[PDB]
Write a protein that holds these residues in place. Structure first.
Motif, PDB file in Angstrom:
ATOM      1  N   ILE A  81       0.868  -1.167   0.000  1.00 57.00           N
ATOM      2  CA  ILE A  81       0.000   0.000   0.000  1.00 57.00           C
ATOM      3  C   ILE A  81       0.909   1.222   0.000  1.00 57.00           C
ATOM      4  O   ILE A  81       1.685   1.390   0.931  1.00 57.00           O
ATOM      5  CB  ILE A  81      -0.977  -0.015   1.196  1.00 57.00           C
ATOM      6  CG1 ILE A  81      -1.665  -1.377   1.337  1.00 57.00           C
ATOM      7  CG2 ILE A  81      -1.980   1.131   1.068  1.00 57.00           C
ATOM      8  CD1 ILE A  81      -2.643  -1.499   2.485  1.00 57.00           C
ATOM      9  N   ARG A  82       0.800   2.072  -1.033  1.00 57.41           N
ATOM     10  CA  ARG A  82       1.759   3.140  -1.259  1.00 57.41           C
ATOM     11  C   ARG A  82       1.104   4.304  -2.006  1.00 57.41           C
ATOM     12  O   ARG A  82      -0.047   4.200  -2.409  1.00 57.41           O
ATOM     13  CB  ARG A  82       2.953   2.576  -2.032  1.00 57.41           C
ATOM     14  CG  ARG A  82       2.629   2.114  -3.448  1.00 57.41           C
ATOM     15  CD  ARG A  82       3.834   1.436  -4.079  1.00 57.41           C
ATOM     16  NE  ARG A  82       3.576   1.026  -5.452  1.00 57.41           N
ATOM     17  CZ  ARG A  82       4.377   0.272  -6.204  1.00 57.41           C
ATOM     18  NH1 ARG A  82       5.524  -0.201  -5.738  1.00 57.41           N
ATOM     19  NH2 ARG A  82       4.016  -0.027  -7.441  1.00 57.41           N
ATOM     20  N   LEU A  83       1.871   5.384  -2.204  1.00 53.07           N
ATOM     21  CA  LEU A  83       1.396   6.587  -2.872  1.00 53.07           C
ATOM     22  C   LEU A  83       1.806   6.598  -4.345  1.00 53.07           C
ATOM     23  O   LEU A  83       2.997   6.538  -4.651  1.00 53.07           O
ATOM     24  CB  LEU A  83       1.992   7.816  -2.182  1.00 53.07           C
ATOM     25  CG  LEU A  83       1.647   8.010  -0.704  1.00 53.07           C
ATOM     26  CD1 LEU A  83       2.162   9.355  -0.224  1.00 53.07           C
ATOM     27  CD2 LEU A  83       0.158   7.906  -0.455  1.00 53.07           C
ATOM     28  N   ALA A  84       0.813   6.737  -5.237  1.00 52.19           N
ATOM     29  CA  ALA A  84       1.049   7.077  -6.632  1.00 52.19           C
ATOM     30  C   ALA A  84       0.977   8.596  -6.787  1.00 52.19           C
ATOM     31  O   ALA A  84      -0.029   9.178  -6.397  1.00 52.19           O
ATOM     32  CB  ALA A  84       0.015   6.387  -7.486  1.00 52.19           C
TER      33      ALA A  84
ATOM     34  N   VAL B 277      -2.720   3.584  -3.204  1.00 52.10           N
ATOM     35  CA  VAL B 277      -3.053   2.410  -3.998  1.00 52.10           C
ATOM     36  C   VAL B 277      -2.460   1.161  -3.359  1.00 52.10           C
ATOM     37  O   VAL B 277      -1.376   1.218  -2.789  1.00 52.10           O
ATOM     38  CB  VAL B 277      -2.587   2.560  -5.459  1.00 52.10           C
ATOM     39  CG1 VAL B 277      -3.348   3.684  -6.138  1.00 52.10           C
ATOM     40  CG2 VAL B 277      -1.086   2.767  -5.592  1.00 52.10           C
ATOM     41  N   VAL B 278      -3.185   0.052  -3.510  1.00 56.01           N
ATOM     42  CA  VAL B 278      -2.690  -1.290  -3.261  1.00 56.01           C
ATOM     43  C   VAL B 278      -2.132  -1.804  -4.587  1.00 56.01           C
ATOM     44  O   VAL B 278      -2.873  -1.863  -5.564  1.00 56.01           O
ATOM     45  CB  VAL B 278      -3.819  -2.198  -2.748  1.00 56.01           C
ATOM     46  CG1 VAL B 278      -3.339  -3.614  -2.453  1.00 56.01           C
ATOM     47  CG2 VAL B 278      -4.506  -1.591  -1.530  1.00 56.01           C
TER      48      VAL B 278
ATOM     49  N   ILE C 208       2.996  -1.731   3.939  1.00 54.41           N
ATOM     50  CA  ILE C 208       2.608  -0.329   3.861  1.00 54.41           C
ATOM     51  C   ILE C 208       3.888   0.488   3.730  1.00 54.41           C
ATOM     52  O   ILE C 208       4.832   0.248   4.481  1.00 54.41           O
ATOM     53  CB  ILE C 208       1.787   0.086   5.105  1.00 54.41           C
ATOM     54  CG1 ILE C 208       0.614  -0.864   5.372  1.00 54.41           C
ATOM     55  CG2 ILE C 208       1.302   1.527   4.983  1.00 54.41           C
ATOM     56  CD1 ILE C 208      -0.214  -0.502   6.590  1.00 54.41           C
ATOM     57  N   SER C 209       3.913   1.463   2.804  1.00 54.32           N
ATOM     58  CA  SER C 209       5.047   2.370   2.691  1.00 54.32           C
ATOM     59  C   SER C 209       5.155   3.216   3.963  1.00 54.32           C
ATOM     60  O   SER C 209       4.186   3.332   4.710  1.00 54.32           O
ATOM     61  CB  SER C 209       4.968   3.235   1.453  1.00 54.32           C
ATOM     62  OG  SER C 209       3.981   4.250   1.580  1.00 54.32           O
TER      63      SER C 209
ATOM     64  N   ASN D 123       3.190   4.913 -10.863  1.00 52.23           N
ATOM     65  CA  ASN D 123       1.950   5.424 -11.438  1.00 52.23           C
ATOM     66  C   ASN D 123       1.272   4.408 -12.363  1.00 52.23           C
ATOM     67  O   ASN D 123       0.314   4.763 -13.050  1.00 52.23           O
ATOM     68  CB  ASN D 123       2.225   6.744 -12.167  1.00 52.23           C
ATOM     69  CG  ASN D 123       2.450   7.905 -11.219  1.00 52.23           C
ATOM     70  OD1 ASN D 123       2.655   7.717 -10.021  1.00 52.23           O
ATOM     71  ND2 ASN D 123       2.399   9.118 -11.749  1.00 52.23           N
ATOM     72  N   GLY D 124       1.716   3.147 -12.342  1.00 51.37           N
ATOM     73  CA  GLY D 124       1.219   2.125 -13.245  1.00 51.37           C
ATOM     74  C   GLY D 124       0.253   1.176 -12.546  1.00 51.37           C
ATOM     75  O   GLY D 124      -0.401   1.556 -11.583  1.00 51.37           O
ATOM     76  N   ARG D 125       0.202  -0.059 -13.054  1.00 49.56           N
ATOM     77  CA  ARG D 125      -0.788  -1.059 -12.694  1.00 49.56           C
ATOM     78  C   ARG D 125      -0.954  -1.153 -11.178  1.00 49.56           C
ATOM     79  O   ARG D 125       0.031  -1.353 -10.473  1.00 49.56           O
ATOM     80  CB  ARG D 125      -0.331  -2.416 -13.224  1.00 49.56           C
ATOM     81  CG  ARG D 125      -1.287  -3.566 -12.954  1.00 49.56           C
ATOM     82  CD  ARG D 125      -0.834  -4.766 -13.754  1.00 49.56           C
ATOM     83  NE  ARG D 125      -1.393  -6.019 -13.274  1.00 49.56           N
ATOM     84  CZ  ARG D 125      -1.148  -7.219 -13.800  1.00 49.56           C
ATOM     85  NH1 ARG D 125      -0.500  -7.338 -14.951  1.00 49.56           N
ATOM     86  NH2 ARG D 125      -1.577  -8.308 -13.176  1.00 49.56           N
ATOM     87  N   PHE D 126      -2.192  -1.001 -10.696  1.00 46.94           N
ATOM     88  CA  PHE D 126      -2.500  -1.172  -9.284  1.00 46.94           C
ATOM     89  C   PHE D 126      -3.741  -2.044  -9.141  1.00 46.94           C
ATOM     90  O   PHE D 126      -4.536  -2.157 -10.072  1.00 46.94           O
ATOM     91  CB  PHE D 126      -2.675   0.178  -8.586  1.00 46.94           C
ATOM     92  CG  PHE D 126      -3.819   1.026  -9.082  1.00 46.94           C
ATOM     93  CD1 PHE D 126      -3.641   1.922 -10.131  1.00 46.94           C
ATOM     94  CD2 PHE D 126      -5.079   0.929  -8.501  1.00 46.94           C
ATOM     95  CE1 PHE D 126      -4.696   2.703 -10.586  1.00 46.94           C
ATOM     96  CE2 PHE D 126      -6.137   1.710  -8.954  1.00 46.94           C
ATOM     97  CZ  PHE D 126      -5.944   2.598  -9.996  1.00 46.94           C
ATOM     98  N   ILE D 127      -3.899  -2.629  -7.949  1.00 48.98           N
ATOM     99  CA  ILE D 127      -4.973  -3.567  -7.661  1.00 48.98           C
ATOM    100  C   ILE D 127      -6.219  -2.793  -7.226  1.00 48.98           C
ATOM    101  O   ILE D 127      -7.317  -3.134  -7.663  1.00 48.98           O
ATOM    102  CB  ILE D 127      -4.521  -4.602  -6.607  1.00 48.98           C
ATOM    103  CG1 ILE D 127      -3.348  -5.443  -7.124  1.00 48.98           C
ATOM    104  CG2 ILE D 127      -5.677  -5.489  -6.155  1.00 48.98           C
ATOM    105  CD1 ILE D 127      -2.540  -6.112  -6.038  1.00 48.98           C
TER     106      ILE D 127
END
Ligand SMILES: [K+]
Ligand SMILES: [K+]
Ligand SMILES: [K+]
Ligand SMILES: [K+]
Ligand SMILES: [K+]
Ligand SMILES: [K+]
Ligand SMILES: [K+]
Ligand SMILES: [K+]
Ligand SMILES: [K+]
Ligand SMILES: [K+]
Ligand SMILES: [K+]
Ligand SMILES: [K+]
Ligand SMILES: [Mg+2]
Ligand SMILES: [Mg+2]
Ligand SMILES: [Mg+2]
Ligand SMILES: [Mg+2]
Ligand SMILES: [Mg+2]
Ligand SMILES: [Mg+2]
Ligand SMILES: [Mg+2]
Ligand SMILES: [Mg+2]
Ligand SMILES: [Mg+2]
Ligand SMILES: [Mg+2]
Ligand SMILES: [Mg+2]
Ligand SMILES: [Mg+2]
Ligand SMILES: [Mg+2]
Ligand SMILES: [Mg+2]
Ligand SMILES: [Mg+2]
Ligand SMILES: [Mg+2]
Ligand SMILES: [Mg+2]
Ligand SMILES: [Mg+2]
Ligand SMILES: [Mg+2]
Ligand SMILES: [Mg+2]
Ligand SMILES: [Mg+2]
Ligand SMILES: [Mg+2]
Ligand SMILES: [Mg+2]
Ligand SMILES: [Mg+2]
Ligand SMILES: [Mg+2]
Ligand SMILES: [Mg+2]
Ligand SMILES: [Mg+2]
Ligand SMILES: [Mg+2]
Ligand SMILES: [Mg+2]
Ligand SMILES: [Mg+2]
Ligand SMILES: [Mg+2]
Ligand SMILES: [Mg+2]
Ligand SMILES: [Mg+2]
Ligand SMILES: [Mg+2]
Lengths: 200, 79, 86, 79
Positions: D4-7, D20-21, D67-68, D29-33
């Motif tokens: 779990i982190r920041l885009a 985003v997860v 988690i970041s 900034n790419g593929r996230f769940i």
RNA sequence: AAUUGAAGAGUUUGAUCAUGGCUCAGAUUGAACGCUGGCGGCAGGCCUAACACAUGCAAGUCGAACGGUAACAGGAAGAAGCUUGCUUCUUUGCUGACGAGUGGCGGACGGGUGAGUAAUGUCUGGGAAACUGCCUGAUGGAGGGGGAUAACUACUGGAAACGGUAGCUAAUACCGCAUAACGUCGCAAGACCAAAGAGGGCUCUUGCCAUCGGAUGUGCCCAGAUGGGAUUAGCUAGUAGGUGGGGUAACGGCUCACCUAGGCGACGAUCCCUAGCUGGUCUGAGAGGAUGACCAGCCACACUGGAACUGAGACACGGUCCAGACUCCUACGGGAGGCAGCAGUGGGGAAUAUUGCACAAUGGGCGCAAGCCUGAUGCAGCCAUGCCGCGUGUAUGAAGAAGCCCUUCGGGUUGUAAAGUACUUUCAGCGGGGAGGAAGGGAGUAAAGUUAAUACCUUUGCUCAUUGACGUUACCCGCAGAAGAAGCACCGGCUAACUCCGUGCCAGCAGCCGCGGUAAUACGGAGGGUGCAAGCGUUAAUCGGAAUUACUGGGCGUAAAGCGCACGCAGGCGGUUUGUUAAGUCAGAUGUGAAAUCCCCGGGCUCAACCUGGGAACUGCAUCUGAUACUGGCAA
């Protein structure tokens, strides 16, 4: 980005008072409001359907000093908004803040008022700012020693001041209470011609 | 239910296999007319029950050969 | 190789290749003996060869030379074939 | 692993972070769940600077999501 | 609240109506060119040669796995000029640390490009026979041994790249043995398979092995959809299916042997040409048409051809091997390299930028952590490439000054234009103040939980210092003075805007019709005017208008268009009644239809562009449950 040319010619080409002068003396004494500008001025040919639609658009523009790109963007906004497009367009132009500085009487002309360029107690130096219902527009304190603003208010005090606003003396402030209806504005602008011109 | 298709046996010549034509009736994307379309599937038929012209229920299964990933469920109608 | 870690990986992977090839060769040798016993057609010989193979394929699976499913296959294929012999 | 982190969205000099997860290997900034919140670091007073779906975060942490550092700090200061 | 939406005109003719093409007004762009050019914000910037590439940088990290000690910083011993207190030359891994080495993890991510690919791809919707590092839950285990090897040392081969020989040594390197079941094989009986320590002060933390789960990722299968060509009609022998052996993580002609003779194809196989696909983008009232650059998802490729190895994962952009075409170093024996990472160079081209700064933020690798690495990224440079905002003054001002230009010489017009006179100071310049992007991390102290412990450790509070590439930041205040800042196209009709002079079918113009042969609003200049404006024009390109491929939405007596006529297979269509079915059709529900984009209502940057919250939408697809008029099937 500004028309910095002789101002009476615009009213002359349009053939109507566009309220573009200070009013130190009469429009008739200043220029020939009857005659269109230039060497071939006393001539007045038939104007085409296109030409009529154009001159109506150029009328509504040249009052405010809004260039075409910015005017086109107002049309798009007016068409987007719900209800009558022509009425929405005039409402958007009337909603502009740089009308207000002039209209409240701080500039002698809109060109002067634009040289002079607070809303809800915050400084706004943007001519195109859309003032909302219930917003208080007002002047600063730092430039109330200018003779321009003194003279301009005395010019403003001879006009019919607007009938959906509340200009005040001294602290020099007024509320944009509501947006104007089409009934408020001059039954002279045929805004359907502008709607039709951009629909073309 | 479990998912099944129904179709006509168009060949029974292979050992333990049949070819089943599924007919579908689809609206043309542009012109709107309803058109017959066909999908032929190679189907497994362990016992060689089916014959040319039989109506059969089939179900999707794991791959059984290069071209076969469907198996026979029942014969609806014999020819 | 240009990068330092890539040079080291080339060395380590070569060492791993030699180590793996030796164990793979050995495992295959023990499997071949079970098939050779079956080919001849002697159950007692085949069960002996199978009992030698069985720990090897299991251990090589644990070490990651082969997957456990591959070890399982070899034991299944040969157990089946040994049972059919007599 | 799943993190779990920041885009980083928003504009130049004016970051806006989507929480985003994602599979850690994917680009920031790419593929996230799943999106589970946002964080605006230059939010004006009155405006909501942070919103986090703490129930969805708890679901993902329960399935072994990390988690970041920044999202952990945002989770603290929210609740 | 969220599909409020649809314009015509010129040109065939002596004239007309129709037909029909050509042309124009609009919107758009990764644009280019010409003239011109002030500032800012936000975005964008090799579309051509997947051409060739000089130079720097784009992948490392861990001493808390290990032997160590090349650095240099301490520490202890033993001695010299001896600042009676130590620098210095020595010895010593003893400690902080750390070059090289072993080992672990990473290097399969991130970044680039669109060559190939018309279907081993992509999109939509399903499926079964699979594996999956790091993360995570549970249940157990974690015993006892062994043989090596790099580094190193001695010798030594090469010009170099890079070795050879002998000896020595460590481990979380490697290998047995033991243990062995909700594991594997087996019908069962049985048989068989693992492991590793390290760190802080016996205890805690962390790692190791096994098995079953989770999560994530990936492999695989099916249906429908996804370009053009019939002036390509037949194609196929592992071919299609079967049985058995082998093979794979896994199903499978995946492979092999044998058996059967299949399989595909006018619902377009095979062959040829072009092409990365999608979300979307542009245009359009819509239906369509065009398109796939930027951003995001998927795929493919990494000098060319081929191959595997290692690994959880690759047949691997900055790995290995071979071959090839190039190019470079050489002692001529041999060696070396791959920017379609970032920047940059040559070349091609109408045309597309700096060999920049920083890891401060977000994210990624390694690490207990500190931190180190990160051309991802954040930023800065260049370019009017676009979008949006602002400036280039404002007011007065008749002398209607000159100078223009035109004029029936009365005057008219430029033009309140200029000057003159009041003023104003944004932006630019110069000088002073000043956010925010910083969360954290580091120090001892605070209590509680582990615990033999008021230890270490963990967590939370507690307090004290401290972290910004951008940056001379945004923004604010002060100074000086209209000062430093307006162009481009057009004016015959279409089409907004007309005169004079020059020229005389010339020079030239032109999108279309046309204009020019002595009174040219059409050429060239001027005066005036119109339109746009830091841009304006031109060219290219797409859709529109074009109902001009017509599904929505057209025609065929004479304008283009009925086969010379018939029979007829495939195909399309099908009188009337009842029953049945429920394929079409219809209704409802459920799942899915990524995010972004578009749209609506809000929110945030002074406004705008731009950013952003929630919704709507995604017209589709699938499944389940119903309806049965109509169409289809079946029966009569
Ligand atoms: K290493
Ligand atoms: K026409
Ligand atoms: K890569
Ligand atoms: K391509
Ligand atoms: K085959
Ligand atoms: K077979
Ligand atoms: K499309
Ligand atoms: K290739
Ligand atoms: K690995
Ligand atoms: K960083
Ligand atoms: K039609
Ligand atoms: K019926
Ligand atoms: Mg502009
Ligand atoms: Mg004529
Ligand atoms: Mg070291
Ligand atoms: Mg990648
Ligand atoms: Mg041991
Ligand atoms: Mg080991
Ligand atoms: Mg054992
Ligand atoms: Mg043709
Ligand atoms: Mg031909
Ligand atoms: Mg088989
Ligand atoms: Mg298959
Ligand atoms: Mg191509
Ligand atoms: Mg249309
Ligand atoms: Mg692309
Ligand atoms: Mg396409
Ligand atoms: Mg392997
Ligand atoms: Mg690589
Ligand atoms: Mg490279
Ligand atoms: Mg480059
Ligand atoms: Mg050139
Ligand atoms: Mg580096
Ligand atoms: Mg005209
Ligand atoms: Mg003349
Ligand atoms: Mg064009
Ligand atoms: Mg059309
Ligand atoms: Mg017609
Ligand atoms: Mg004729
Ligand atoms: Mg005819
Ligand atoms: Mg006839
Ligand atoms: Mg007939
Ligand atoms: Mg009928
Ligand atoms: Mg139905
Ligand atoms: Mg969406
Ligand atoms: Mg019926």
């Amino acid at each position: 980005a500004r028309y910095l040319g002789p101002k009476l010619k615009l009213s002359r080409r349009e053939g109507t008072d566009l309220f573009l002068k200070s009013g130190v003396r009469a429009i008739d004494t200043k220029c020939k409001i009857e005659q269109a500008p230039g060497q071939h001025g006393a001539r007045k040919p038939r104007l085409s359907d296109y030409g009529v639609q154009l001159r109506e658009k150029q009328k509504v523009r040249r009052i405010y000093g809004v260039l075409e790109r910015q005017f086109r963007n107002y049309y798009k906004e007016a068409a987007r908004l719900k209800g009558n497009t022509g009425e929405n367009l005039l409402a958007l132009l009337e909603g502009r803040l740089d009308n207000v500085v002039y209209r409240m009487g701080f500039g002698a002309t809109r060109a002067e008022a634009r040289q002079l360029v607070m809303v809800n107690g915050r400084v706004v130096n943007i001519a195109s700012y859309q003032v909302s219902p219930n917003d208080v527009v007002s002047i600063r304190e730092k430039a109330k020693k200018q003779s321009r603003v003194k003279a301009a208010l005395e010019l403003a005090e001879q006009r019919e001041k607007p009938t959906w606003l509340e200009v005040d003396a001294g602290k020099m402030e007024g509320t944009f209470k509501r947006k104007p209806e089409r009934s408020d504005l001059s039954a002279d602008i045929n805004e359907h011609l502008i709607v039709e011109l951009y629909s073309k | 239910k479990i998912r099944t298709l129904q179709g006509r046996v168009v060949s029974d010549k292979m050992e333990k296999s049949i070819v089943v034509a599924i007919e579908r009736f689809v609206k043309h994307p542009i012109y709107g007319k309803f058109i017959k379309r066909t999908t032929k599937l190679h189907v497994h038929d362990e016992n060689n029950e089916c014959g040319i012209g039989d109506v059969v229920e089939i179900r999707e299964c794991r791959p059984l050969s290069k071209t076969k990933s469907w198996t026979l469920v029942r014969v609806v109608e014999k020819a | 190789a240009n990068i330092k870690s890539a040079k080291k990986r080339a060395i380590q992977s070569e060492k791993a290749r030699k180590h793996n090839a030796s164990r793979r060769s050995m495992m295959r040798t023990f499997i071949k003996k079970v098939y050779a016993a079956i080919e001849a057609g002697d159950k007692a010989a085949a069960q002996k060869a199978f009992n030698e193979m069985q720990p090897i394929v299991d251990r090589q699976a644990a070490k990651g030379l082969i997957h456990k499913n591959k070890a399982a296959r070899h034991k299944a294929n040969l157990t089946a074939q040994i049972n059919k012999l007599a | 692993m799943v993190t779990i982190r920041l885009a980083r969205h928003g504009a130049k000099k004016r970051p806006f972070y989507q929480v985003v997860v994602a599979d850690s290997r994917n680009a920031r900034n790419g593929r996230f769940i799943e999106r589970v919140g946002f964080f605006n670091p230059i939010a004006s007073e009155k405006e909501e600077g942070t919103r986090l779906d703490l129930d969805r975060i708890a679901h993902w942490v329960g399935q072994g999501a990390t988690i970041s550092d920044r999202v952990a700090a945002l989770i603290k200061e929210v609740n």
